[PDB]
Amino acid sequence: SLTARSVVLSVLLGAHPAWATASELIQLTADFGIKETTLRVALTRMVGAGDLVRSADGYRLSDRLLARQRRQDEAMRPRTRAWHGNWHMLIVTSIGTDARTRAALRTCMHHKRFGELREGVWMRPDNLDLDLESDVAARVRMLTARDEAPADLAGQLWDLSGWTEAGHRLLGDMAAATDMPGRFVVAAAMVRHLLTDPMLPAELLPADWPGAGLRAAYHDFATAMAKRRDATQL
Template sequence: MAPEIGTRTLVHGLLREDGTVDGAELYAVAEALGMTDQQVRLCVKRLVADGRFTQEGRGRRSRLHAAPDAAGSLAPDVEYVRHAYRQDRGLAPWDGNWHLFAFAVPETERRARDAFRDTLLHLGAAPLQGGLYVCANAIGPIVEAHADGLGVRPVLTRFTTRDLRVGEEDDPVRLAARLWPLREVAARHSALAALAQARLDRLTGPDRPTGTERLVCAVELAAAFTDAMRPDPLLPPELLPRPWPGTRARALFARCWEALAEQGDAEGPGSLRLFRLYDRTGAAGGGTARPGPGPSATRRHPED
C-alpha cells in the first residue's frame, strides 16, 4: 500500500537538481495520485507566500523556483542513509558500547530542555529515566554540537559503558527490544518492502510505466522510505531480531531506484533532487557513497 502523500510533499518530491518544479509534471503526478488541481494551486500559493518558492507562469505552464534554503521534505539525511546501508552490508558492526547522555535543564529554560530532548530522540536515543538517555551508536560529538547550539552544554554529561542493566535485564538484544519500539519500526519497513516489491515488478515487467507513472513511483517510494526510516534508531544488526525487515526493504528500494535510473531520461526521475540524494548514499547499485554534507540540525548522523 502506497503511503499517503500530501501536496507539499509532492512539490518537494518533484524538485529538480536545478531547483525548479515543472508545472506540467506537478499537475500530472498530482492527478495520478488523486489530487485535484485546486489542491495543488492552494499548496503552491502557500509555498510562495511562505517564501519557499517563486512562481513563473500559471497552472500547468508554470515553473516553480525553490528559494536557496528550500529543503526537500522527502529525503532522510545522506549520512544517515549511508550508515543504514553500511550496517546492511556488515560494514558497521557494534563495538558493544552503550552511549549515555544525562542532563538537568531548569524549568526557566524549558524550551531549550524540550528541544534538546527532542534532538536526542531524533538521533535514535531512548529514555532510561528522567534526563537520562542511551544510544547504541556513537553520536556523542553530534549531541554536543546540538547542546552548544541550545546553550545546554554546561549541564550535559555523557559517558560510555559496556555494562548496562535496566532493572534485572542486561542482555543487549532484550534491552534493545525493551527500550526501542522495534515492532512499529519493523512494521513500517515491511510496508516499504511490500510497496517496493510491487513497484519493482511493474518497473521490470513487460508493461513498463510511462514518464508520469515513473515520477509517481519515485515520489511514492521516497515517501515510503522516509516513513520507514525516520523513526528507525538504526540499531546495530547485533541488537535486532533476525531477519530484520529493514534490510530487505532497503535492498528492494535500491533495486527500484536502479530500475528507475535505467528507464530515466533528462526529463524523468533521474533529474529529481531526491533521486540524486539517494544515488549519493550508495544505495543505488550498492556502490561506495561519496561523502555527504556536514551535520544537520534536523537529521541523525551515526558515526562510522
C-alpha cells in the same frame, strides 16, 4: 499526506538544479488527481512562502528546502562506523526550567536516536557521531559505557519487536498498494518510520530487522518518481 505541496515535493525529488514548467507539473501531478486549479494556486503559494523559486524556465526547489531535503537523507543514512562495544551516555543533571524546555529535551534525545534506559539516562551505541547541540543540551553529563549483554540492553532501550512488526506491515502495505497515490502514502509512512530507526550496528540487529527492506522500497519509489519526470521532460 496526498496534499498539493507535499506531492509537488515528491514529483521534484532529485530534479534540482533542473527546472520544471507548469505544464510538466500539470502532467506529473494529475495521476495524483489535481488539475491545474489547486496546483497553480499551490505553486504560487509555495514560491511566496519560500519553498520554490520560479523563473522563465519554470520551477525548482528553494535552496532552504533543498538543504532540508539533504538533511533528511543524511538522517536516513547517517554515516555509521564499524562498532566496538561502546555506548554514548547522556545523564541529565539538570531539570529544564519549563514545559517547552523539558519537552524539547525529549524531542532532542529522540532525534539523535537515544533510548531512555530510565528517568534521566539516555544511551545509544557510539556508531553515530554524537555532536551535542550547543547550549540547549549543555546540561547533561556525557560518558562512554559498555554493557555485557548489549543486544539485551538495545532491546530494553527500544521496542525492537514492535518496530520490526510495524516495518513488515509497511512492506505488506507497499506490496498491496494499487496506484501511485497509494504508493505515495505508503512511502511517506516509511519515511516517518525510518526517522525513528535506532540505527543499530550489525551485531545488535535481529535477523528479521526490516531496515534495509524499508530503505530499498523507499529508494524504489523515489526512482519511479524521478523516472516519470524524465518520461514527461524528454
